[PDB]
């Protein structure tokens, strides 16, 4: 019906399935996972489990299982029934895979896809003291409360703040000092992972379901230190990881236009279904159910990142290993 297969819900693994489809259709990543040497102890290797799930979503015509992948985490069956945060998984799973790609033909793939660099400028206001900090990121936490849309939320992110009072800057020989702090992006990665801060702390964790609009095309040149007139930082919406429920618990699905062509499907665990743009974007603006994570791909790299993957990208040794496993 859709051309794409879903993933079985072991019980509470909606987070994993939605993340897995998200990474699965990051084609360039899947290409590199297939190329990882798992020639690796069965059902102990997260890479081997990731190749198995990726192979199966690419070949099966029935919903695919994730039992061996949770086994390779070290988990007992009970853990497949504890609900989790998709961005927390994403941080841990990509880190694990990144380290496991070191020393291989595909070292550096995850940072090439996902890693950018921030800069933070600090300027004392009553003394001549400036300082500098450049840090790599793999995702961006974007504030939501009081912000209408993603654009205002980048504007706020780059806005100057006063480091004053209990937050005075430790300016060295000048001791604590009032200062201004400002952040800018040095680079933006080809695949952009945005985490919307849909939470605030009655002493409880409360989900923010307020309306937050996000676009199909996102111009980000305004939030770079130096713009490249060659490769403008224009991004195309690829995925909407949607969370429904409260902070205690809920459900995850993800909407994706796999080819970046504007043709959208919805992935609710075992069921994939075509949907409209209106249903993937505007209906997830919030205002129970709303966008939590957004995946944008840089327009200049859409062709490469979403390059079509076929059976010539799966090594035969793995095809033998996976099939000769019964």
């Amino acid at each position: 019906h859709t051309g794409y297969v879903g993933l079985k819900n072991q019980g509470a693994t909606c987070y994993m399935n939605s993340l897995l489809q998200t990474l699965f259709f990051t084609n360039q990543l899947r290409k590199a996972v297939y190329m990882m040497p798992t020639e690796d102890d069965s059902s102990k290797s997260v890479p081997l489990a990731l190749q198995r799930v990726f192979y199966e979503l690419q070949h099966s015509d029935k919903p695919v299982g994730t039992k061996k992948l949770t086994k390779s985490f070290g988990w007992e069956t009970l853990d497949s029934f504890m609900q989790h945060d998709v961005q927390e998984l994403c941080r841990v799973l990509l880190d694990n895979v990144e380290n496991k790609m070191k020393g291989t033909c595909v070292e550096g793939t995850i940072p090439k896809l996902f890693r950018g660099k921030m800069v933070s400028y600090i300027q004392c206001k009553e003394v001549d003291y400036r300082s500098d900090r450049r840090e790599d990121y793999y995702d961006i936490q974007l504030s939501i409360k009081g912000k209408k849309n993603i654009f205002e939320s980048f504007v706020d992110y780059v806005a100057v703040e006063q480091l004053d009072g209990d937050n005075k800057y430790d300016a060295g020989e000048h001791g604590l000092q009032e200062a201004e702090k400002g952040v800018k992006f040095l680079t933006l990665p080809p695949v952009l992972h945005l985490q919307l801060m849909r939470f605030m702390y009655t002493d409880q964790n409360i989900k923010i379901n307020d309306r937050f609009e996000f676009p199909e095309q996102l111009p980000l040149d305004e939030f770079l230190q130096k713009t490249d007139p060659k490769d403008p930082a224009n991004y195309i919406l690829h995925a909407v990881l949607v969370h429904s429920g409260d902070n205690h618990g809920g459900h995850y699905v993800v909407y994706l236009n796999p080819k970046g062509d504007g043709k959208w499907c919805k992935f609710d665990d075992d069921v994939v279904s075509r949907c409209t743009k209106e249903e993937a974007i505007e209906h997830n603006y919030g205002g129970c159910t709303n966008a939590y994570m957004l995946v944008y791909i840089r327009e200049s790299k859409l062709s490469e990142v979403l390059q079509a993957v076929t059976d010539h990208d799966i090594p035969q040794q793995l095809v033998e290993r996976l099939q000769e496993e019964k």
Partner: protein, 75 residues
């Protein structure tokens, strides 16, 4: 040493820490200044979520380093 912490509002607060501090120590200091219970804090630095049991030195977290605080939307 003074690091920065981006709080759930996007605002930057300073935190007074030592390379020796474990992640639980930093989570405890964030509770002291921002009120968030450690049990709910998740700390993002250079794409890594910091781990209870490791130290700030284990991450080359130095002065003027920024950590990003988040909660959990479970599902």
């Amino acid at each position: 040493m003074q690091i920065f912490v981006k709080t759930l509002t996007g605002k930057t607060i300073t935190l007074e820490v030592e390379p020796s501090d474990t992640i639980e120590n930093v989570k405890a200091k964030i509770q002291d200044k921002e009120g968030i219970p450690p049990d709910q804090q998740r700390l993002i630095f250079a794409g890594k979520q910091l781990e209870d049991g490791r130290t700030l030195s284990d991450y080359n977290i130095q002065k003027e380093s920024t950590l990003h605080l988040v909660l959990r939307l479970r599902g």
